[PDB]
Structure 1
Amino acid sequence: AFVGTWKLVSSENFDDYMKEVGVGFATRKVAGMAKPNMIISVNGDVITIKSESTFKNTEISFILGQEFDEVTADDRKVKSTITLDGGVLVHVQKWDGKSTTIKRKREDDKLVVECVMKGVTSTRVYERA
């Protein structure tokens, strides 16, 4: 359901989200005008999510319910746990007593990414490439 190549088509509140996470202005400026592709693949237990953009490429590979070390696009060193809850991929990142949740869900033709940090929610919609 998640496997594919996905292109960003809309975004709400992403600058506020990155500011709440603690991302500096210059990174927010280039990350916000980026229009990434998200490439999701699976082989057995291992899910890979790639983000490709002219700002930064990133990749995570993980097993559901197995905490892993992640370096984010903004260079945060986080402890990440991804689970699959009612069709939703729920990704929690924990660092310095803080946390952020990124939910990836399939709604109609879209892949919806909901990013929560404290009182800020950002919603990013992707469509198949």
Structure 2
Amino acid sequence: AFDGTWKVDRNENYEKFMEKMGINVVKRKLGAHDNLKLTITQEGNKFTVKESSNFRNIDVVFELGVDFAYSLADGTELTGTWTMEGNKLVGKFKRVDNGKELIAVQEISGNELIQTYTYEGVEAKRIFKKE
């Protein structure tokens, strides 16, 4: 599964996705080189993710199928759920400020972890390698 420590390797269309989200030019450069590392552990229906990046170090804890709130590094708040569909984690979120939907899918491709995000018609992906 997703268990383990994962470190971001490369991105696809990420700066354009950040621009749509409204992140300023300089911040997008920083975002794209965030050194993000995720440590994922599961305990039944619940996941604990240690998110560690140049921006912050926080714990993200959620139960599959239960809504929870999550804040983006820039302060943007989302609420939504993650559910396991097949072998992927599908996340359906909504920004609290403007009510717009933000979808995220997480899947394993060989030995890489791929996250894909969609927002307002733009897609982005972040690919992680296992440490």
Provide the TM-score with structure 2 as the length reference.
0.90
2:129 corresponding residue in structure 1: 127
Counterpart of 1:104 in structure 2 is 106
Question: In the aligned structure 2, how far is the partner of 1:101 from the partner of 1:125?
Answer: 16
Instruction: Return the offset for 1:11.
Output: 0.7
Check 1:116–1:25 CA distance in 2 against 1; reply closer, same or farther (3 A cut): same
Q: Is the 8 A contact 1:58 1:72 kept in 2?
A: no
> How far is 1:68 from its partner?
0.7
Q: How is 1:1-129 mapped onto 2 (pairs within 5 angstroms)?
A: 1-95=1-95, 96-129=98-131
Identity fraction in percent: 29
Structure 2 segments unaligned to the other structure (5+ residues)? none
Which SS does the other structure have where 1:54 is aligned?
Answer: coil
Q: Which amino acid aligns with 2:108?
A: R
Give the whole-Å Cα distance in 1 for the aligned partners of 2:56 and 2:25. 16
Q: Distance in 2 between matches of 1:103 and 1:87?
A: 11
- Cα distance in 2 between the residues matched to 1:102 and 1:122: 10
How many residues align? The count is: 129
User: In structure 1, the residue corresponding to 2:15 is in which secondary structure?
Assistant: helix
TM-score when normalising by structure 1: 0.91
Secondary structure of the structure 2 residue equivalent to 1:9: strand
Distance 1:56 1:120 in 2: 26
Of 104-113 and 116-125, the range deviating more from structure 2:
116-125
2:28 aligns to what SS in structure 1?
helix
1:63-108: CA deviations, max 9, x gaps? 1110111112121121121011111111122122201111110111
Asked if the contact 1:69–1:80 (Cα under 8 Å) also holds between the matched residues in 2, the reply is yes
Unpaired segments of 5 or more residues in structure 1?
none
Aligned-residue CA RMSD (Å)? 1.4
Mapped partners of 2:29, 2:59: distance in 1:
21
Question: Which of structure 1's runs of 4+ aligned residues deviate more than 4 A?
Answer: none
